[PDB]
Amino acid sequence: RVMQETMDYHALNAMLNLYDKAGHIQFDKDQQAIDAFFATHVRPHSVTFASQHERLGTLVREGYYDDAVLARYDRAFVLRLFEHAHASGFRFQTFLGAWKFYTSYTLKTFDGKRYLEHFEDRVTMVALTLAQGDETLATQLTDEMLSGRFQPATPTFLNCGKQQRGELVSCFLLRIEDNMESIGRAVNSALQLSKRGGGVAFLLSNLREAGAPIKRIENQSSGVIPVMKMLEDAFSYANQLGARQGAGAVYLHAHHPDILRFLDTKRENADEKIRIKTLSLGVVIPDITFRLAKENAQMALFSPYDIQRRYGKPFGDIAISERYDELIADPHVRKTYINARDFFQTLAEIQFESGYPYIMFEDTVNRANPIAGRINMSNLCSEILQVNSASRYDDNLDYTHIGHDISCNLGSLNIAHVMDSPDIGRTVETAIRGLTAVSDMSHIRSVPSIAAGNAASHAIGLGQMNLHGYLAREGIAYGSPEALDFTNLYFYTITWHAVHTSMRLARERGKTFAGFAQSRYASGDYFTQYLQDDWQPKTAKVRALFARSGITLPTREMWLKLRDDVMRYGIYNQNLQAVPPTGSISYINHATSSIHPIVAKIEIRKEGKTGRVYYPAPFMTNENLDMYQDAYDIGPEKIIDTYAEATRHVDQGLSLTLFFPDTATTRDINKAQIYAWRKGIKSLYYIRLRQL
Amino acid sequence: RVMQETMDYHALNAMLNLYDKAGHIQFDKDQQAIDAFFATHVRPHSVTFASQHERLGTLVREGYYDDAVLARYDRAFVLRLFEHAHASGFRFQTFLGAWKFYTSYTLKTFDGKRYLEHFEDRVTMVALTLAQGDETLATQLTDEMLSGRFQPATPTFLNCGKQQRGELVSCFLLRIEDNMESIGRAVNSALQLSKRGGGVAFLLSNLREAGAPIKRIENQSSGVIPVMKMLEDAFSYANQLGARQGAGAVYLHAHHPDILRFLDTKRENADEKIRIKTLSLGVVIPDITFRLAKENAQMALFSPYDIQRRYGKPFGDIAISERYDELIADPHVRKTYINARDFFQTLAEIQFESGYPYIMFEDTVNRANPIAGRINMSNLCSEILQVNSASRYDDNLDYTHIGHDISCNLGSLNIAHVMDSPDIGRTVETAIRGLTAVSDMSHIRSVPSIAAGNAASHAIGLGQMNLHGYLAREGIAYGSPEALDFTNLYFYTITWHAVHTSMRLARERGKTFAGFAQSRYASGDYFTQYLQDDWQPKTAKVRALFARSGITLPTREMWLKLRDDVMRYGIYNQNLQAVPPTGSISYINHATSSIHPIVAKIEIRKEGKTGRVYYPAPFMTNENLDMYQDAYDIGPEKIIDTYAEATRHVDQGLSLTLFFPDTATTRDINKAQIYAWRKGIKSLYYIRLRQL
Numbered sequence A, B: 001r002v003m004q005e006t007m008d009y010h011a012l013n014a015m016l017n018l019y020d021k022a023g024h025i026q027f028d029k030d031q032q033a034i035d036a037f038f039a040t041h042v043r044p045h046s047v048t049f050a051s052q053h054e055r056l057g058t059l060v061r062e063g064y065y066d067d068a069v070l071a072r073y074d075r076a077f078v079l080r081l082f083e084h085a086h087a088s089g090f091r092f093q094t095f096l097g098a099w100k101f102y103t104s105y106t107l108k109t110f111d112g113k114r115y116l117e118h119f120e121d122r123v124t125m126v127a128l129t130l131a132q133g134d135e136t137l138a139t140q141l142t143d144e145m146l147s148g149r150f151q152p153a154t155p156t157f158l159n160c161g162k163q164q165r166g167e168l169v170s171c172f173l174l175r176i177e178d179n180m181e182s183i184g185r186a187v188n189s190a191l192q193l194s195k196r197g198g199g200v201a202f203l204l205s206n207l208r209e210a211g212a213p214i215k216r217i218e219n220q221s222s223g224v225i226p227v228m229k230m231l232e233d234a235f236s237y238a239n240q241l242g243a244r245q246g247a248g249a250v251y252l253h254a255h256h257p258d259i260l261r262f263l264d265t266k267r268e269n270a271d272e273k274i275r276i277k278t279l280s281l282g283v284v285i286p287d288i289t290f291r292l293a294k295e296n297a298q299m300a301l302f303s304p305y306d307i308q309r310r311y312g313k314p315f316g317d318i319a320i321s322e323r324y325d326e327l328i329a330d331p332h333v334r335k336t337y338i339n340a341r342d343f344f345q346t347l348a349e350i351q352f353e354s355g356y357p358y359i360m361f362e363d364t365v366n367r368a369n370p371i372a373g374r375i376n377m378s379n380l381c382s383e384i385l386q387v388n389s390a391s392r393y394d395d396n397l398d399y400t401h402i403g404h405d406i407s408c409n410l411g412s413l414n415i416a417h418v419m420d421s422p423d424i425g426r427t428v429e430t431a432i433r434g435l436t437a438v439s440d441m442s443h444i445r446s447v448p449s450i451a452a453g454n455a456a457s458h459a460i461g462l463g464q465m466n467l468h469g470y471l472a473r474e475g476i477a478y479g480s481p482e483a484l485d486f487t488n489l490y491f492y493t494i495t496w497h498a499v500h501t502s503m504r505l506a507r508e509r510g511k512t513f514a515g516f517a518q519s520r521y522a523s524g525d526y527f528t529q530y531l532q533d534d535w536q537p538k539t540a541k542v543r544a545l546f547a548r549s550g551i552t553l554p555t556r557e558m559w560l561k562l563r564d565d566v567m568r569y570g571i572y573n574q575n576l577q578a579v580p581p582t583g584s585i586s587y588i589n590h591a592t593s594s595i596h597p598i599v600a601k602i603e604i605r606k607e608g609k610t611g612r613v614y615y616p617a618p619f620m621t622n623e624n625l626d627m628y629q630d631a632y633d634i635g636p637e638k639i640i641d642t643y644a645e646a647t648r649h650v651d652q653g654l655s656l657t658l659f660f661p662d663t664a665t666t667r668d669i670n671k672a673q674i675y676a677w678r679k680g681i682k683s684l685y686y687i688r689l690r691q692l
């Protein structure tokens, strides 16, 4: 206090990376870094206005905040809230969560020399923004975000309410039809989306294979690679401001003739002009492929060219599994053959050397998918999963028929914090509303097919973070039967409330998502799954928690009751949850990324002027370390295990990474994937091999 | 005859490449190759129908010819012509002109096993096609083409009237505005155009320089290179059917900040990702730049970014020359500086090692340009030169305002053959009509801005071939004062008739090209140039020729008379002539490519199953070899000289190549270019260094 010492919060931070003769960490040194931070850097560079009122005036007047948002409430309420917010007694819990938010989130002055916002402000404008002028909502979003219960996606949190601003949404999925126009559109769409920082993934699977015909003259199509090449260069050119390298991804169906040339753009010892250095790869794999590789058979690759001709649909749209045999019989459909086993072999080697081919288990997916149509691709994070539909052009690239593409608006709940306010239902409801708002205000001008999609589907991505964090606090162990029990039941109870909320919006707004009638929501089967049993706290400790919390587990009475509202009223969103990884927000929200064990006790980031910055995990103390085992230490099985439990309920997907030791073998990898597959998992993200 | 010997017309052809103890060529061995050709390969594989009538029926019925063309005339006339044609007694003059036309032009059966057309047929359908049902026209085009007087562009000759067919036009010029949309459009437009074999050149000059701002935040634009990269990959991907490698070109103004990074994509000892292997480069150079380099000064490169901001126009549109000083004064316009001398130095080294940077003498050009607006770029052959105008987009790439871009439809006259039918005026008129037709029927769907352009401008490219051929026949010598005299007067007389014809169409059709009123055609100055004198056969031999031909040289009476019709009636075409090189047609038409000395006595091509194919030049005999000196032997001056003479009259441009010995020095080159510049030349094509 008064005339204190040690103002190096970077050093203080560092202390978090020392072990005492007894293998304990000085957690407190971190806390000190915070104090020092604010003390020596936050406050002195934070602008302080006479009153809130004068503050906005200024912020509006010099074009920082957007007067358009404020204009939907009576200024006094806009003043009451800024006050509520600042009086809720929020502190940051870590020297980085603070450091993160002020070096990358909080609004600064155009000249970069002064902070103009603090968390509450940010929370506030976000709330105001999404609330769209509905005051009680606005309040609640404020509350939920301040408590730590909710955490909207970065794009949103970062931009809501500012004047100079990006858009509120950031990952995108486009499809490509088999013709020049659709291609030019793709290349274009990439340019436009990327210029504004978006992640875009394209579906290559419909493109005619290398060696296919064009205008009826044999051996002419040149495959997909020269198209990756373009997307590639597009992305590399139209990076976002303040970054080199955009972020693109492509997915190709595994039974597609170019699949090998496809994987081959990643094998380092290669050729030139055939080398893709910044696209992410994803492979879709149907079950048969496993069945094949199992009996060491031959995979048959079918021509999209031919398929289209003979079936009136594009490769990307038919059901390979259900038509494998039929297809091998149709002599009007050319076939090539490769050794499944050698395929998965190739797959794994690449994953080993570069982390990728994302994997999307086509069959598991479509089969659990409550929505009409098939799902043929995924996001750059492999967690979005939704039907899409083809778009058609006029010779001049003008659309003649606008299909539907997928944009994705996410946010997450910090499990811990939710389990802590007995009023779970409110928590879920708000979030859903919040998220839905993101959608409603979204209107991507430059890719008509995306805008159409959103508008039609109102699709959102409610997701979760902090699983480990929680379990740990409650002294349960990642992976444990208890854990499993917990995660199943929780995602169980969350799901009940979101459908319920979406059921509500449906009613409130007089409409539903397009195509609802065809859904499994319309005819009720969606619920069959919840009408049997299984919904009974296996472990004692788990039943416990839920009570010491006041959370009531949805009961057959509730489901049966919910099922009738839907069939009578429908829901507003075509898709509720999705569990992405949780980038740097986590550090702000103080969580453990997503639902997967903690990558380290003291996480280290290559950031800031010191070189690095250390992040101790939530609730962790010298008296509980033994509940913090690395994901590496926990290992694949356990992770694959948790995510499944979450999969019987999540209607989209969950980014799942497997952590392996640097001595793992492709077979090792390969097994894991199999476990994953047999186990229900919808998709697989990355395989990380531990490294420095 | 009856039971003859030696049927190897490839061998016979070869004999053309032997010199006898006295340095004479057996020209006759070639003629024999022809006879053998037809004898052993043409006829036996040429389909012969019972009558013409049954023939079309078939050809229509199996979808070879296009019934739509025939449907505009009474079948009997369509029968009368096929007859006229076949009775005009046309033979080919060379074993390759035949060989060329049947291996690349004449219609064959879908399965490639039989010829279905012969020249006359082809001439005929072309005539029919262009004639658009006007019978006397149709006849004439037939006549002119059969005589050798006219030779429409390859795309046209090749496709007119067929069912399965490409378009009738093939080089294209697009501009790019400084913003993502315009860029995506460019990349797209490239894709679409190229897929159908088009040559496209883009104007890069408006793009913001490497290091310019974006959304107001310093140092961010990444220049033009990543855009060349895209175009590059586009072209490489969407080659035409039966070819690898599309054909793209870019032009950049020499006073543009990226000019050096620009040339640098061609210096072989380079880096990767910055290496452009299939785009053609073109540089625009205004006069000052010479003035600069002369007094070894400093070139100042101005920011397009800034220019736009301060002048409300894009770099690509202002007059650098006229605003050089003004610009260096405006501190609101950033400047970089480079050593002019070192610039031209760089230029030449590249040209030396790779033939390019085309050069377009901005100033000469705009200054001679009779049409409103500036000209800022050129074609992949550097001979088209026309005003263009910016296009504007809506966020979705939909045009909100369609500008004008340039497409180009050419054809040429074989000088010789023209000088041979005293009725020059008919010859010119037809051609113009023929060409105009190409335009009228043209409607490029996929790049709105091109279609708009054409429709507005009706711009055509009448051009010439066989200059050497002629002069030689008449024992004049390439380059000679006589020659010069001849080429000036001829292009002089041709010009009179085309304006006249365009003046006629104007009247016949009740309209003119858009913007005519602003032209120098409207106010008459166009003619001032022809109202003084100069128009008087300097050489005696030249006056001679024109008489022994019956050609009357336009007289001050005619010009004065023509000038009044225009000011009263206007013209239909915004642009009449352009003298491109003459690819493989020449060999068919039997000419010397364009107006520039013959690249060899016996030209050799890497074509056909033998390896090569030998092409002896027109009118050449053992008793006149001394009138056939290589372009290498003639040398730059002389060539630069001829082309000028042609430039006081050609309203667009003339592809000019300089042939140099393999010991020439960049200074050597550099001088030539200067001569060219001081001499009026509008643009410079390639520099060829003799090689094997």
Ligand SMILES: Nc1ncnc2c1ncn2[C@H]1C[C@H](O)[C@@H](COP(=O)(O)OP(=O)(O)OP(=O)(O)O)O1
Binding pocket: A178, A179, A180, A181, A207, A208, A213, A214, A215, A216, A221, A222, B194, B195, B196, B237, B238, B239, B240, B241
């Ligand atoms: N000209 C081309 N050059 C390179 N690739 C091409 C070309 N044309 C088509 N492709 C590839 C890209 C698409 O996957 C597919 C279809 O393109 P598209 O324009 O629809 O062809 P098309 O209609 O002319 O031929 P088709 O009759 O075979 O469909 O062909």
Ligand SMILES: Nc1ncnc2c1ncn2[C@H]1C[C@H](O)[C@@H](COP(=O)(O)OP(=O)(O)OP(=O)(O)O)O1
Binding pocket: A194, A195, A196, A237, A238, A239, A240, A241, B178, B179, B180, B181, B207, B208, B213, B214, B215, B216, B221, B222
């Ligand atoms: N996001 C980007 N990434 C890479 N290059 C870009 C990006 N945005 C623009 N450029 C370059 C390409 C064009 O030459 C030029 C203008 O693009 P454009 O979309 O018109 O920019 P802008 O309107 O957002 O910014 P400005 O306000 O500076 O014009 O900027």
Ligand SMILES: [Mg+2]
Binding pocket: A178, A179
């Ligand atoms: Mg097609």
Ligand SMILES: [Mg+2]
Binding pocket: B178, B179
């Ligand atoms: Mg702009």
